[PDB]
C-alpha cells in the first residue's frame, strides 16, 4: 500500500505519493527518475492509470532532498512517462507540504518556503498563507529553474489536415514546442480537445524526429516532451489561453507552469514582456496562472541555436509562477498481488503518421 | 473544518471497472425505500454524484455507490448506484464489488469456519442476493462473488431504430436485466468491438439510447419507477476461447463498462433463454472490451399469468422471467477520504466530454 495526498491545481490532478514506496538508489533526483523509469515503471503505471487513476492523471513521488538547501526530493510522472519538472505539481506539493505539516511553519509566518529538489534542478517555492491561519494556504508560487528560448521559427511538416507549421522550441523545466492554435486550424475549445491531443502528439513526434535538442547544462534532457498550443484569451484578465499536450497525449487542465515559463522566456527574448511585468495565462477550463520574469542572465561560452555568433553566451530567465491547489483526497492505494490490473491499463489507442 | 462535508470510500474495481463505494459522509436521506432515496439524491443532491464521480476526484468512466442501512427485510446493506450521467436501478459489477467489500472490510460477519458468506443487497431494483466465495485457508479473503439478480426478461424483439449516418437503421432487442437494455450486434453498427472503435461505440450507444427513448415507451410491469432504456449493450464474437461472446455496454454520459456488465449479461441470458439457446444451469461466459470474463447461469424461470410485455405471444400464458446468477472478481484498490473545500471551483467536478 502507498499513501497519497491527492491534490488538484485548478482542475489538474497531482497525486503526491508520500509513503510506502520501495527504496530507490540514486545520488541525485535525475538518477532516481532514471531508476524508476528503467527498473520500476510498474509503480507509475499502477498509480497513474485506470483503475486507480485515469488517462489524464498526473503525480509525483516524494523522496529525501539531495541537493543542498532543498526540503523535498520529487520525481514527476504521468500516463506516458516522467517529466523533469511540473509547475502545477510543484504548486500542489508546496501547498500539501504546508497544509499537512510535512514542513514546519515558523511562528507568526505569513509565507513559508518549500524548496523542491527536482530532476531539472532546484525549485524554490513559497506557500502564501491565509492571514489568521497557522497553515491554510491561499496560493503558492514557485521560482522555476532557468528558462530559455532554444530555437525559433522551426518549420515542421505534419500529416493532413495540419501540414506545415512553425514553432518555437523553449525550455521551461521541460522542452516545449510552442505553436499557435491558428496554425493547426483548430480553436482552443473543449469541443476540439481530441483533435488538440492528436495534433500535439503528431507535432511532438515530428519535432523529435527532425530536431535534436539538448539542454546545455543538463545532459539527461534531450527530447521535447510537451507541446503548448496557444491562442487568444477568453477571460479579459488573461494575456493568452493555452492547452499543453504531453504524456500519452493527455492534456493539462491547468495553464501549465513550465509551459508558462517557456512562453514567458520566449516573449521576453522577443522584447514582448518586461522583467517584473505580470503575465496571466488561461487554460482550457478557464483557470488562471500568474507569472513574472524575475531576472535574466547571460551564460558566457554556452550557446543554443537561437544564440548569436556575436553573443558570447545564451540568455536565460528566472520566472515565478503562481496558482492555487486544493487537497481533494487522502488516499491509501492498495495492490493485491493477484489483481490482474495491479499495474493499471489504458484504453487509449496509439497514433502515428504513415 | 477540513473534513467538513468529506466522504469516506472503499475504492474497488471488478476486473477493471471502478466501484467507488461511499461508506460515510451523507446526511440522512429521506425515503422509505432505496428507490426513493435514489430519487431524493437525484432531485436534491446531484452535485454530490458529480463531485464524487467526475474529474478531478473521478473521471469520465468512473462508477460508484452510496451505502445505506438496509430497509427491506432480509437485507444486509442498502445501496444506491451512481455514474457520470445519473443513477442506475441496478449494477452487476458494483454489486459484486459491494459483496466483496462487505466481507473483506468486516461490514458483515463471517460465521465460524464458513466457506461462503451471504450478503443481501437492498437496491432500487429489488433484493439482490449475493454470496462471497472465500479463499480456502483465509478468514475473509474473497476469491470471487456471485449475485442472484432481480428477475430478468426479454421485453420486445426486433425493434427498428433509425440513427443518423453512418449508422442508419438498426434492429435491437429490448430486455430487462436490472436496468432496461437495448441489445445490438456490433455488426449492425458497421464497427468492430475494439479499443480502436471505443469513441465511436460510445457515440453509437448514446445515439441509440436517445432515439429508443423517444420512439419506444418501455415500462417494467412490476416496478412503476422503471420506464426508460438506460443502457446499450453492443455485442460481437468473442476474442477469448473461453467466452461465448464479447460486449461493451454504453451508459451514463456515454461512458463504457470495462467489465462484461452483470445486468447486461443477465439481459443477454434472458434473451438467449427466451430463444431456447441456454438451459437452466448452463454456464454462459461474457467477455468485455478489456478481455475480462463474467460467468452466468440461469437458475430458474417462471411465467407470470395475466401479465404481458410486447414479446409475450397471444399463444402464451403470461410473460417469461428468469433468475440469473452472475459471478466475477473484485479487488480493493484503495481506501479514500474525499475532501470538498467550499472555495474549490471544482468541488462539484467537471467533464471535458463533448456536449
Ligand atoms: C507538468 C505538466 O503537466 C506541464 C504543465 C506544468 O504545470 O508544468
Ligand atoms: C452498473 C453498470 O455499469 C452496468 C453493467 C453492470 O455491471 O450491471
Residue numbers in the entry:
A (entry chain B): 45 to 398
B (entry chain A): 40 to 394
Sentences from the paper on this structure:
Proline racemase of Trypanosoma cruzi (TcPRAC) is an enzyme present at all stages of the parasite life cycle, contributing to immune escape and persistence of the parasite in the host. Gene over-expression increases virulence, while knockdown appears lethal for T. cruzi. The structure also showed that TcPRAC crystallizes as a homodimer and bears a catalytic site on each subunit.
Atoms C2 and C5 of BrOxoPA are covalently bound to the sulfur atoms of Cys300 and Cys130, respectively. These covalent interactions can explain the irreversible inhibition of TcPRAC by BrOxoPA. The carboxylate moiety of the inhibitor also forms a hydrogen-bonding network with the main polypeptide chain or side chains of Gly131, His132, Gly301, and Thr302 in the active site region. No electron density was observed for the bromine atom of the BrOxoPA inhibitor in difference Fourier maps, and X-ray fluorescence scans indicate the absence of bromine in crystals of the complex, suggesting that the bromine atom of the inhibitor was cleaved during the binding reaction of BrOxoPA with the enzyme. The crystal structure with BrOxoPA shows an enantioselective addition, 2S, at C2, while C3 remains achiral. The BrOxoPA complex also shows that a second reaction took place, leading to a very tightly bound complex, as indicated by the cavity volume. The saturation of C2 allows the folding of the molecule to position C5 and its bromine atom close to Cys130. The second attack released the bromine atom as reported for haloketones. The complex with BrOxoPA, which formed two bonds within each site, displayed the smallest volumes. Indeed, alpha-bromoketones, as found in BrOxoPA, are known to be highly reactive.
